[PDB]
Design a protein around this ligand. Structure first.
Ligand SMILES: CC(=O)Nc1nnc(-c2ccc([N+](=O)[O-])cc2)s1
Length: 334
């Protein structure tokens, strides 16, 4: 008896009803810009499969960010490009401004708009209750848009949400793990940062969907309103699930496993032990209480659910009373 299959309860067939060339990124033909339009200024980061630089566009003197892709698979490069082009112009989605090659060595690089981001080590220390609601609503706009366009981000975490606080500007970045959703497809569960991985990933349930992004978003919310980053801090993947179960409780965890007929490694029942479901108020103290409200806790509680089918969609989340003051303030023209 294998696990019970699952499909997304919204936007299930968005790619099915779109032309092949929308989601078939291997057939995409890239049109290359000019590498000599950009000058690299300083290395911002490196990880993975790329190195990221602040750069200048020397045709107009604008700052941009250049990500040079190490020789990671061609297929992964075309997937990220196709997804960035598909989502371009969507709300709070980082803009891919150019794609270039070294003409001689054939090394590809993505060029993005620059975000002057307030460093997420600090920021989270002057953000008000209103600020959090505002930025959460903007993140939800981006997720509802990319989900509605048939795409899962799969790496939602504070490092991938750039915020230029003085311009109240937010961009969702690093689409290198993002994938097209197709119902019934079994996906790689090695995505997302450990601290933001959903239960589906940690119990190796491969037929997941957009709702994975909503778990990750719930983790960010908790860490922002309770001022504890990351909120669920496991020392490896097994322990990550234990940290979740110490809050959400083991009873609902086993009901989840039971519903999808999922088989856990023997050692898990050993280290998961037995834990009550805690009240969210347990994490409210003098220092974070100004960021917490009944609305906030009701919202968080509908995001952080084991069962991926029972979590709010991005759209439903934007309807939540937590955002009432944001939404009325954002209804304009100028
Ligand atoms: C000061 C500073 O860090 N500015 C930045 N502005 N946009 C950035 C960026 C955009 C996209 C990606 N990406 O998508 O992988 C990475 C980084 S970084």
């Amino acid at each position: 008896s294998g696990p019970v299959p699952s499909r997304a309860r919204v936007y299930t067939d968005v790619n099915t009803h779109r032309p092949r060339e929308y989601w078939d990124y291997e057939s995409h033909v890239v049109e290359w810009g000019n590498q000599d339009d950009y000058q690299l200024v300083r290395k911002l980061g490196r990880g993975k499969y790329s190195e990221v630089f602040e750069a200048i566009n020397i045709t107009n003197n604008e700052k941009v960010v250049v990500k040079i892709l190490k020789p990671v698979k061609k297929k992964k490069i075309k997937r990220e490009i196709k997804i960035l082009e598909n989502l371009r112009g969507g709300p709070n989605i980082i803009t891919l401004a150019d794609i270039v090659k070294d003409p001689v060595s054939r090394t590809p690089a993505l060029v993005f708009e620059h975000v002057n981001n307030t460093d997420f080590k600090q920021l989270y220390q002057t953000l008000t209750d209103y600020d959090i609601r505002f930025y959460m609503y903007e993140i939800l706009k981006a997720l509802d848009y990319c989900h509605s366009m048939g795409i899962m981000h799969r790496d939602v975490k504070p490092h991938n949400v750039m915020i230029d606080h003085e311009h109240r500007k937010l961009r969702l970045i690093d689409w290198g793990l993002a994938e097209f959703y197709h119902p019934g497809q079994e996906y790689n569960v090695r995505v997302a940062s450990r601290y933001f991985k959903g239960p589906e990933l940690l119990v190796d349930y491969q037929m997941y969907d957009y709702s994975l992004d909503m778990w990750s978003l719930g983790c960010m919310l908790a860490s922002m309103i309770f001022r504890k980053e990351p909120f669920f801090h496991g020392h490896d993947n097994y322990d990550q699930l234990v940290r979740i179960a110490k809050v959400l409780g083991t009873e609902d965890l086993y009901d989840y496993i039971d519903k999808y007929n999922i088989e856990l490694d023997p050692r898990f029942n050993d280290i998961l032990g037995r834990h009550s479901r805690k009240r969210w108020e347990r994490f409210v103290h003098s220092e974070n209480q100004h960021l917490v409200s009944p609305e906030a806790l009701d919202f968080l509680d509908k995001l952080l659910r084991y069962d991926h089918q029972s979590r709010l969609t991005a759209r439903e989340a934007m309807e939540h009373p937590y955002f009432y003051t944001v939404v009325k303030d954002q209804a304009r023209m100028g």
